[PDB]
Structures are given as C-alpha cells and as structure tokens.
Design a protein around this ligand. Structure first.
Ligand SMILES: [Zn+2]
Lengths: 364, 283
C-alpha cells in the first residue's frame, strides 16, 4: 500500500502526549479557511486528556474513536475538504481526509505507512532502560500512563499486566508508549512482565522490523535490545559457571570486559560468536542455518580485518578459491588415519577420538 | 501433585507429628491452599459453592464459605480473622508449634521474629538438616502465589473497573465504608482469600446490575473480620458437630409423624451465607 497523495506523517515520540500546539487551521485554495476540525483517536480514553481550549484558533472541534469500516475501503480514500481532519497515533488505515493536505502525528510506523511523506524530527536519547525480574514492586495499571505520572519519574521498578481481551496492536501500542518515556527518564527502570512472552518476543521481532523501517530515515540510534530466550538462558548459564557476585549484572558488563582484549588478541570471542549465532535471524540464523553471516570486523587504521575465521585483507570475499591449497599430501586420509592410530594406541582409548587438519584463508 | 499449605506444613520432630492431615481436596486446585479440615479447625468456617446460572444451567459457579460461629459468643470469640495488629492476640502462638508460629509471622510480615528464630535455629542440629530448605520452599510457594501479581492480578487489573466493593450497600450501615480501605492494607494473599470467600450482594454486568440477597450478612471489622451482623441480635447459627444448664423451653410438640407426612417438602438448610457489596464484571 501507500499513503494517498496529499497526506503527510510526523513521527515523534514526544507525540505520545497530544501536541495541541502544532496544528494550524487548514484552508482550501481560495483562502477558504476551515475552522471545522475533527480528530480520530484509538479510544475515548485519549479524548479524556485533550483540551478544546487549546484551540481558540478554531470555533468547531470534535473528536471520535476511529472505526475501520468496510464500504469506503480504497487505496484512494474519500475526501471531504469541508473540515480539517487529524488522526492521532492511528493503528489502522484511514478512509477519509480533511481540508488541504492532511497530516497525522504518530509514534509508530505501521506497515500501512511505508511509502509515505514523512518527517521524524528524531533526537538521540542515550539512557537505555532495562528489564529486571527477580522471580519492592511498583504496581502499574499497565495501560493508562498519567495514572502513574510522577510515579514513573520517582520509582524505577515496575510491573506490567494485561487482561486477556487486549488486541495485539493495543498491546504493542501501550508498550511502545512506555519505552520513550523511560529513555527520557534519568535512570534505568526495571520492567517486570506477567506474561509467557513468547508471542511477545514475536512482536519484539516486529519491533525490529519497525525500527529498521524507522532507520530507513532514522537516527541510527544505539538502541539497546536483545533476544529474550536463546540469549538469556545461555548467558545465565555462563554466569553460573562463572563466579556470580552479581546475578543482576548487566550483560554489557561482560560484553565490554571481553572487548578489552579484542585488539591485543586480534580475534573474536566465542561469546560474541554465540551472539549472532543463537538469534533466530540476526545470527547464524537457525531459521535458515546461515552462518554465512560471518563477521568481518575492522578497527581504526588497520591494514587488515578480523573475520569470524582469522585475519583477512580488507574488502574481499573471505577466501580466494585460488590458494596455497591444503594440498592433499598433507591431510591425506592415509596419514590422518596413521597418526590417529598412533594417538589411540598411546592414549589407550577405545572411542570418542576424531581428528582434522587445520585449514587457511587469504592469510596463512 | 498436592498443594494445601497445611500439607506443606512439617513438624521439626517425629513427635508433634503434623498428623490429622489435610482433606483429600489438597490434591485439588482451589486457590484456598487451606484444606477444608484446617479451615474448620482454625477459623470456624467451611467452604461452599454458589451455583450460578450461566444465563442457563450452563456452568457458572462461585466459591463460598459458611461460618461456624455460634449465636451467643461475643467479641474475640466472634472474630473470624485477625490483623497483624492482633494476630498474636488471637492465635496465642506460643501454644502452637514453632513452624506454625513462623508461618503466621510470615503472613503478618513479622520479619523481626522470623529472622530471630531463624538465626537461633541455624546452629541447631535439626536446622543443619534441611528444615531451612523446607521452610524456604514454603516461602517460595507463597512467593509464587503472590508472583501472580499481589495487587495487579488480585485487583489492580487492566480490567481495573471489574472491582469488588465490600462496603455495605446500606447508606445507614455506616460502620462499613473505610473497611474497604482497610482491605487494601491487608496482605494481598488475604485479600485474595476474601475475594474467594465473600459473595457480593450485587453485581454490575453489561447485561444488568443484579441483586442476590436483600440485606448484608456481616460487616468489615477493624482488626480482622468477625461475625459482625450489621444490626440487631446475632442470627441463630446452629451447631452441627459439663455441669451446666441447657434449658430449652420447647413447645410440647405432639404432632407426631411430621416427617413421614411432609418430608417431600423442601427441608430448608440454614447455614449462614456471605453476601457483601457490589462486584463489577464486563459483559
Ligand atoms: Zn491442609
């Protein structure tokens, strides 16, 4: 799909609250100013926090919940220049537009909004928030934000909850609402979530798609995120094997600790390889079994780079087929077997032994 | 698999064995965690089920308990439940076994005594034995039972509006009211237990608001719940199982063969229900 001509989107996380100010009276060509204004919202709940008096510019202001009808469905929606119209963080495609070019102000890029006139006015928010789940708690009414305004400012550990009936889109909405404000907060508050989370992990994948959609025009922010099962179980286990002074210690701790040694040893930690190995997709990708996504890794001023598989010269496809080949006089089955038998005898070992020659790439 | 907290109860020594064990329902899933045996034993109550017409003979059902208090006794003897304010005053914990007193200190958050007795036991031979891990297994059990959110799951739901008010409907029954405020301050485990026990007088549904008994059975009490009729004389609670008077000035009652004549007619049971206040449920 696409946005029909004469519509534009402003994304800003600040728009999580209604930006009353920005809107201006639309007019038709011929200066036919349109003080009639209608706004569509996901819920009357939204309307509860919207003041008419903000808009003395207009004499006629009304607001209703969006409903996705059937009969008007079109790539080209119905037009009605007789009133200005705005949709506020709409979830689903819109069937009618107001005076002049219509504009929408939303926090989230839906698939519907892909090919669209767009502006984001993004800015980097540094402070990544965090999850923590021990199993005192801040209980939250896990939808209405301002219910807990100042509460979220003051405390840093919050419970997250839902009734069954919630539409997946509504869940996604409210969650997305959270994280913006959290990155605005000065401290990494800890999420706690009362859900089996598997499909929630799936919608996290969807967040990945959405955020890439942003990145098509975005800030390339250093946005923290993670896989939530295949990572976490293994990381927990790894710490377990390690001394566990802080079971609560952030992963990035370990990350950068390992980082300290990269250049001096010029090689990739197994840890980071298991990362980008045990994601569904951004990894060796068990989805498709694509270790072919080897990491080529470079650092400032280097004449060379570190692959998943040793040193490489810059910007070349991991290994030239022409090579100082592992000529089969070496790595001959026969010699391999002979040496292996020597080994087995010497060990006095019945079983469980295998051997393989080393191999080499661009460099030896 | 078995879940009754009183089946989880263990005794520190072979003598003082925690015999007379849980009712077999301990194998059931009920969310009381008390066996009915223990519920009778400790608080003079027995649990029960409301059959609700699911708009039909179709299954809609709700749990209830009858109380087992008599009609004559007063005050503490009428009390059903304490607060931490008075839990020791009600239980006389010293009579009770040390793990029982421990668990009461858990419910009432007497961490001071809890840690005191824990530290005393540490070096005792029987606590170098895995009694510690047993007690903390009970701890973990409660932790799960409140891992279901103690406020959010129990009442601070995202369907928040589907609230129970236990406040007395009668505007003249003014000793209620802030009892509902107390409810928030009771520990969430107990809040849930009440939410089980107590029938509402009323429920709002998108279908209708509906009314189930004319007048409330009891009232909220300022320490813990009590056989607390809003007004008048206490209703005659019969008892179903020492040099004193037991006069019963009965009517002479010579109309023999009454039962053989009438027994087909409805033999109205008497045990006191627990109507109180207004539930709200969406659709
Ligand atoms: Zn029991």
């Amino acid at each position: 799909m696409e946005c029909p001509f004469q519509i534009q989107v402003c994304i800003s996380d600040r728009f999580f609250a209604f930006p009353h100010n920005l809107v201006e009276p639309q007019s038709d060509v011929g200066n036919k100013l349109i003080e009639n204004l209608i706004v569509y919202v996901p819920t009357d709940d939204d309307r509860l926090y919207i003041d008419k008096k903000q808009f003395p510019k207009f004499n006629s202001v009304l607001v209703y919940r969006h409903e996705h009808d059937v009969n008007i469905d079109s790539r080209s929606p119905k037009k009605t220049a007789s009133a200005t119209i705005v949709y506020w963080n709409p979830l689903v495609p819109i069937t009618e537009i107001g005076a002049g070019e219509t504009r929408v102000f939303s926090v989230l890029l839906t698939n519907n909004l892909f090919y669209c006139n767009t502006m984001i006015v993004h800015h980097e928010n540094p402070k990544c928030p965090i999850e923590f789940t021990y199993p005192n708690l801040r209980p939250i009414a896990c939808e209405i934000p301002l219910s807990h305004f100042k509460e979220l400012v003051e405390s840093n550990d919050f419970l997250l909850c839902f009734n069954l009936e919630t539409s997946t889109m509504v869940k996604i909405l409210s969650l997305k609402r959270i994280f913006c404000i959290f990155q605005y907060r000065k401290q990494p508050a800890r999420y706690v979530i009362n859900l089996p989370h598997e499909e929630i992990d799936n919608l996290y994948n969807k967040l990945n798609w959405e955020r890439t959609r942003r990145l098509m025009k975005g800030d390339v922010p250093s946005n923290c995120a993670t896989v939530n099962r295949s990572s976490l179980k293994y990381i927990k286990q790894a710490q377990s094997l390690l001394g566990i002074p802080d079971y609560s210690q952030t992963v990035v701790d370990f990350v950068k600790m390992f980082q300290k040694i990269i250049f001096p040893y010029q090689l990739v930690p197994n840890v980071i390889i298991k990362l980008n190995n045990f994601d569904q997709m951004v990894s060796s990708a068990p989805n498709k079994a694509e270790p072919y996504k080897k990491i080529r890794l470079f650092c400032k001023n280097d004449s060379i780079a570190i692959s998943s598989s040793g040193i490489v010269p810059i910007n070349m496809p991991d290994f030239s087929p022409p090579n100082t080949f592992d000529y089969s006089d070496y790595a001959n089955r026969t010699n391999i077997n002979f040496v292996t038998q020597r080994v087995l005898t010497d060990g006095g070992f019945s079983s469980g032994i295998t051997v393989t020659p080393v191999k080499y790439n661009y460099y030896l | 698999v078995n879940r009754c907290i009183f089946a989880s109860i263990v005794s520190f020594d072979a003598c003082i064995t925690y015999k007379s064990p849980c009712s077999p329902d301990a194998y059931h899933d009920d969310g009381w965690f008390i066996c009915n045996n223990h519920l009778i034993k400790r608080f003079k109550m027995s649990k029960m089920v409301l059959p609700i017409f699911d708009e039909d003979d179709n299954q809609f059902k709700m749990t209830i308990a009858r109380h087992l208090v008599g009609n004559k006794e007063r005050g503490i003897k009428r009390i059903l439940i304490p607060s931490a304010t008075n839990y020791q005053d009600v239980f006389n914990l010293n009579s009770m076994m040390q793990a029982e007193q421990l668990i009461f200190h858990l419910i009432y958050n007497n961490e001071n005594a809890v840690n005191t007795i824990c530290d005393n036991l540490k070096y005792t031979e029987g606590f170098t034995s895995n009694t510690q891990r047993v007690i903390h297994s009970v701890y973990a059990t409660t932790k799960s039972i409140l891992d279901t959110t103690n406020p959010n799951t129990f009442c601070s739901r995202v369907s928040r509006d589907e609230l129970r008010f236990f406040d007395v409907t009668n505007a003249r029954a003014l000793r209620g009211g802030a009892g509902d405020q107390l409810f928030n301050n009771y520990s969430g485990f107990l809040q849930n237990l009440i939410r089980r026990a107590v029938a509402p007088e009323y429920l709002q549904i998108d279908t209708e608001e509906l009314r189930f008994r004319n007048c409330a059975t009891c009232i909220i009490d300022e320490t813990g719940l009590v056989a607390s009729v809003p007004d008048g004389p206490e209703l005659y609670n019969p008892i179903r199982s020492r040099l004193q008077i037991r006069n019963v000035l009965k009517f002479e009652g010579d109309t023999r063969e009454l039962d053989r004549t009438l027994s087909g007619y409805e033999e109205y049971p008497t045990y006191v229900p627990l109507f109180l206040g207004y539930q709200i449920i969406n659709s």
